[PDB]
Design a binder for this molecule. Sequence first.
Ligand code: MG
Ligand code: MG
Ligand code: MG
Ligand code: MG
Ligand code: MG
Ligand code: MG
Ligand code: MG
Ligand code: MG
Ligand code: MG
Ligand code: MG
Ligand code: MG
Ligand code: MG
Ligand code: MG
Ligand code: MG
Ligand code: MG
Ligand code: MG
Ligand code: MG
Ligand code: MG
Ligand code: MG
Ligand code: MG
Ligand code: MG
Ligand code: MG
Ligand code: MG
Ligand code: MG
Ligand code: MG
Ligand code: MG
Ligand code: MG
Ligand code: MG
Ligand code: MG
Ligand code: MG
Ligand code: MG
Ligand code: MG
Ligand code: MG
Ligand code: MG
Ligand code: MG
Ligand code: MG
Ligand code: MG
Ligand code: MG
Lengths: 77, 149
Amino acid sequence: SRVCQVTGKRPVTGNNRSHALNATKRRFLPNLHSHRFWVESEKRFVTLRVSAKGMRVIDKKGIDTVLAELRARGEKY
Amino acid sequence: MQVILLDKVANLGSLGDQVNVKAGYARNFLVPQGKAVPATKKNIEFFEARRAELEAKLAEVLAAANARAEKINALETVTIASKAGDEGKLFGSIGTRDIADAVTAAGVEVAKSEVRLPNGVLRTTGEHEVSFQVHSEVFAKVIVNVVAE
RNA sequence: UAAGGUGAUAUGAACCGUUAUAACCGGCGAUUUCCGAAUGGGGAAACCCAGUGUGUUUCGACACACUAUCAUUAACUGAAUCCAUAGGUUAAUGAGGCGAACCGGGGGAACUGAAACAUCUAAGUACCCCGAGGAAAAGAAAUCAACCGAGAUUCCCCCAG
RNA sequence: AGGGUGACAGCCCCGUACACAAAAAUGCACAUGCUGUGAGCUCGAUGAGUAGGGCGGGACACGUGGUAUCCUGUCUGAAUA
RNA sequence: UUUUGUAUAAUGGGUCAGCGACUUAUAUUCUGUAGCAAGGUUAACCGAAUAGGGGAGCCGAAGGGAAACCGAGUCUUAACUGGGCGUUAAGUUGCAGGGUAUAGACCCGAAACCCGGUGAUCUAGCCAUGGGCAGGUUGAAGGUUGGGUAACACUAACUGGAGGACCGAACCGACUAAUGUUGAAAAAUUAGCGGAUGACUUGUGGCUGGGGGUGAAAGGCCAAUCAAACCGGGAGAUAGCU
RNA sequence: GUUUAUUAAAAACACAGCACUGUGCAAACACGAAAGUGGACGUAUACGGUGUGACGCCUGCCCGGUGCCGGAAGGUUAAUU
RNA sequence: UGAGCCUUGAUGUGUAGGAUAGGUGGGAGGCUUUGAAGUGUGGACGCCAGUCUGCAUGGAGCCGACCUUGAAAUACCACCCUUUAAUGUUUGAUGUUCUAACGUUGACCCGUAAUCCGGGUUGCGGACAGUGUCUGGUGGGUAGUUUGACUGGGGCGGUCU
RNA sequence: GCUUGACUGCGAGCGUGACGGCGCGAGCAGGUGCGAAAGCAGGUCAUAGUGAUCCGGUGGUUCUGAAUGGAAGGGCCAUC
RNA sequence: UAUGAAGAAGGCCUUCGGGUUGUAAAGUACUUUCAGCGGGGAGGAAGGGAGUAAAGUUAAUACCUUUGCUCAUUGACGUUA
RNA sequence: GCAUCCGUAGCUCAGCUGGAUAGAGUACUCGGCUCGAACCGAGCGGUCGGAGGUUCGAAUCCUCCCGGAUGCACCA
Ligand SMILES: [Mg+2]
Ligand SMILES: [Mg+2]
Ligand SMILES: [Mg+2]
Ligand SMILES: [Mg+2]
Ligand SMILES: [Mg+2]
Ligand SMILES: [Mg+2]
Ligand SMILES: [Mg+2]
Ligand SMILES: [Mg+2]
Ligand SMILES: [Mg+2]
Ligand SMILES: [Mg+2]
Ligand SMILES: [Mg+2]
Ligand SMILES: [Mg+2]
Ligand SMILES: [Mg+2]
Ligand SMILES: [Mg+2]
Ligand SMILES: [Mg+2]
Ligand SMILES: [Mg+2]
Ligand SMILES: [Mg+2]
Ligand SMILES: [Mg+2]
Ligand SMILES: [Mg+2]
Ligand SMILES: [Mg+2]
Ligand SMILES: [Mg+2]
Ligand SMILES: [Mg+2]
Ligand SMILES: [Mg+2]
Ligand SMILES: [Mg+2]
Ligand SMILES: [Mg+2]
Ligand SMILES: [Mg+2]
Ligand SMILES: [Mg+2]
Ligand SMILES: [Mg+2]
Ligand SMILES: [Mg+2]
Ligand SMILES: [Mg+2]
Ligand SMILES: [Mg+2]
Ligand SMILES: [Mg+2]
Ligand SMILES: [Mg+2]
Ligand SMILES: [Mg+2]
Ligand SMILES: [Mg+2]
Ligand SMILES: [Mg+2]
Ligand SMILES: [Mg+2]
Ligand SMILES: [Mg+2]
């Protein structure tokens, strides 16, 4: 499903407004993208389904550190 | 996306130069090909250590350069036994090989490659100034003489 | 605990007991067919069809045991592809489903009211989904106060319609 | 207290008030023994793609309103005793 | 019962018996009554506990003004001789009752809206695999053999067996009329009628699910129900109507 | 041939044919939050949609209105800055 | 290739004229081997009037400057504007070429007894496409509703203060 | 002819409306105008020329200002 | 190297009008052969030596010598092409 | 409710692009010539939408309006 493997972002629901404030139910989905991340330690490419916000944290946190949390999370990368 | 260079990628600079660059460049090309590394605390310090370590190598070599220099610069004149010139004209040329052997016996080892015979090839007999390019830039100066055989 | 007793409709029959192995009551065990998470495979539930191994023999067979999937962990093997990795085979554990309400979370109406009807109300109610417990949830101040002070959370009465 | 007994029972019966009872299993609590578990003192350290912000919503009694505060789908992004 | 008006030929009722509709909770106002009285009274809670404790609070004894403020005055205004609102006048807590308010709110009754399920054993379409269509006609293309042409073309005879072809049973349809209309039957029977080798018909399975399906298209059909199925829930929806 | 099973079998629907239009194949389109499937294991001599409705003779005039198609200079104009 | 900006230079007619005086001042200063004026067309711009000025040219001259001009002058110095020529910068606009994200419902290999999927190899495409947030347009495709009353029944007509 | 009373604060007492409201009003205070003065003037011979509340805008205002000083915002006055 | 005419000036001639040098220059873009400097870098290099193991060679295959191999090798020019 | 722009022979428009003073085509008169077509050149037909600010100099720039247009907004 539409779940970020790094940040855990999932679809959320909200309202479409209008000039008359009429509210209709809608969904907000993450900006998910399948990317092949280069992991130096294994000299391999591992593909992850990440959001655009998740991509930013990978540079800041390091590719190895996030995967370590993923193994703790049991996400089965 | 700060990242530390590992080579001279295009115009980005040379090995060891943190520079701000668009994310995509390194996020998928520079790093997965190994041309550079992300500028992180651990990595940057190691590279800065590598920077200062090569600086110490430069220091040490140039330090030992002045060592050889002084060793032989201050006087330390040597003379070689060349077939009696007989009223002048020496019976042979004094080449880099022969002159290097002379200083080497004195102790200050010098390879003929380094030797640079200025303004001649030591043709006459008697005293004749010389020079040695001890380092890549440092210039020296030695007096060398010739006598009987 | 006992002089009576073999459940009921429900008699009868044939019997069992009477001073303690009748019966009855309780504790602890044993047995517990088939279907059903159903788990050897399949299936129109209570049926059909096996495989492996141990042990039996009257040489026709027979009796037990094991064989689902997933998660976790550890071994062994094992691609493209040299290592590896994916993958694969075992072995251990654990989970599966059911159940009233209460609880947390993910979704989430409309009728109705507004004397119509869009914002609003109904209502985060009904309902659906996920998870847990005997309670759950919350919880140990980046909280309030107001220049005085209070000192986690939860619940009740006020404050106050 | 009640119930039953051939019509309305304190003394007919079963009970009731009180006084007692467990081979075995089990709850609870105290004590105690093992198996883990670490108490105290000093010096440090003090939660960053986070707070905050832009956009779109939601939650706070509070419907965007001059609207604090909380949660964030999106885009950014600090200080750090 | 409803009406200006009903013996009315307006509605209701075959009869009896049973059941069947102004309630409850909370708050508020008014009346009655009881207690205390410029005071009255506690709530939660504690409590051997309908006691007692608990005065946290609530109402009242002071109002005027938007408010700051002032105060038996106050506001208005620059100011009022003014004017507005107040100042002598007992309230409060129970109990009962009359109203009001929120709840289904005196009872019964919608057509519907929304949510979650159940239905293609009927029917519609489609899919797979099987079956059925007596008998009798008409005689296409093509073919052969002649006749004709330089060769065809063309023509004749004979073979052939084409067709959403013909007549007509099974089968399938359902046009007319009569009967039937408390039916033999919640759509049929009798006598006739159309198709009847095909866009046919049928058996057994399968698939499409409700704002959806399916539809050679009638708003038809989707379990005797269809301009939005059925079942349960919201739900005692709402009903200025009877 | 088909149709209102259960008051309407028709001149209604379908029909072969005709024309317009979309569609270059990861096709258009449709069912699906999506994956995917149908279209089609087809490829413009194909497929979808629309109207007309064998055949015969024919199908004239209007682009102002409303759509559609083409153009892009100018006018106007959102988020953003 | 636009453009905000970087600095420099340069630019300036009412007329009258002293006229290449934009305006605004100070302004008898100005002037000066540093090359007196200066020759050589140095050109540009501009009134094409004129002006500064590229390197040499020669050797003491050089200049405020009345009628007029609003003003008094490219004598003069300071300060602005206009005109702006170039200069870097900062943002964009296209176009071209790449690969490395991304796409592949191209080929090949493996997982594998597999027209799924995944991995690998390769080709093609490629910073597009596609997707997310925001946003303009369109949108009976699909919803929720409105669409008055009086009235010799209603509608139509008329009326509503 | 001269002027701005088409005045400001008020208002005894009345009229007419279910109400919202509408209408009439001497006189009082402060400042005016015209008259020499008595006096008259709170628009027009009278009766039509009109639209509540909410929301928002403008000016004024020691009313308020969510710890305090401000401010925002609100209130009041004038007014759209 | 190209642009570059006001056919610069200057030179010389002059029919005193000119021409001639001559796009030559200046100027303006442009490039850095070699020579300046710096930093790399073949080839000439075959060899034998040391070892090894086998083979031929023997009384003993000791001795050798033949293979293969293994390690380390050598450039005067030469601051080489 | 603002913001911007436009207004010139009868007409259609240059605006004499922002001060050192109005142009064309068409309308019409005359003429050239010529039966009309059809052709040409002169002439005529404007105080520049109006009113305030300027300076020596504005139809042209500033203020104010009038009419027109396009924009915005927008919920008494
Ligand atoms: Mg089984
Ligand atoms: Mg309503
Ligand atoms: Mg438990
Ligand atoms: Mg912390
Ligand atoms: Mg943030
Ligand atoms: Mg927000
Ligand atoms: Mg507001
Ligand atoms: Mg509001
Ligand atoms: Mg707020
Ligand atoms: Mg009567
Ligand atoms: Mg009657
Ligand atoms: Mg009746
Ligand atoms: Mg009372
Ligand atoms: Mg009490
Ligand atoms: Mg008190
Ligand atoms: Mg008073
Ligand atoms: Mg009452
Ligand atoms: Mg009631
Ligand atoms: Mg037929
Ligand atoms: Mg027939
Ligand atoms: Mg027929
Ligand atoms: Mg039916
Ligand atoms: Mg419906
Ligand atoms: Mg129902
Ligand atoms: Mg309800
Ligand atoms: Mg009801
Ligand atoms: Mg027919
Ligand atoms: Mg019918
Ligand atoms: Mg039929
Ligand atoms: Mg019929
Ligand atoms: Mg037709
Ligand atoms: Mg047209
Ligand atoms: Mg058209
Ligand atoms: Mg509709
Ligand atoms: Mg509704
Ligand atoms: Mg009516
Ligand atoms: Mg505050
Ligand atoms: Mg060179």
